[PDB]
Paper text:
The second library, LL2, used a more diverse codon set encoding mixed amino acids (F, I, L, V, H, K, N, Q, Y, D, and E) for four randomized positions on each of the Z domain and the affibody, so that the functional diversity (1.91 × 109) of the yeast library almost reached the theoretical nucleotide diversity (4.29 × 109).
We adopted the Z domain of staphylococcal protein A and its affibody binder dimer complex as a model system. We next generated libraries at the interface of a weakly associating dimer (Z+ ZSPA-1) with micromolar affinity to determine if we could affinity-mature the interface by coevolution. From the structures, we could verify clear compensatory changes between the residues showing the most significant covariations (13A-9B / 17A-31B) in both LL1 and LL2 library mutants.
Author numbering:
A (entry chain B): 1 to 57
B (entry chain A): 0 to 56
The structure:
C-alpha cells in the first residue's frame, strides 16, 4: 500500500512553519521528525500547535 | 563505499521549499517526491523551486 505520506508531509509541514510563536530550531526539529516518519504527522502537528499556543505572547 | 546521507542539504532544501510563499501544493509535492527519490539533487531542486516561486509572485 502507498500511504501517500509524501503529501501528508507537505500539508503538515506547511502548517508547522506558519505557527508564529515557534522558534527556528523548534520548527526545524519538527520538520526533521515529520520527514523521517510522516506516519506521525498528526501527533507532530498537535505537539507543535500545543507548543506554539503555549509560547504565545 | 561512502555513505552520503545528505542530512544537512536535504533538511535545508525541504525547509526553504516549505517557506516559498508562491508555490502551489502540487509543486511542493512534486519537489518532495523527487528529493526523497534522489537526495543528491537537493541543490538543483531547491534552485528550480525558487525560480518557480519568483515566477509566481
Amino acid at each position: 500500500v502507498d500511504n501517500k505520506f509524501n503529501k501528508e508531509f507537505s500539508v503538515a509541514g506547511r502548517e508547522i512553519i506558519t505557527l508564529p510563536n515557534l522558534n527556528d530550531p523548534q520548527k526545524k526539529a519538527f520538520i526533521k521528525s515529520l520527514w523521517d516518519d510522516p506516519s506521525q504527522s498528526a501527533n507532530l502537528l498537535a505537539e507543535a500547535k500545543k507548543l506554539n499556543d503555549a509560547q504565545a505572547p
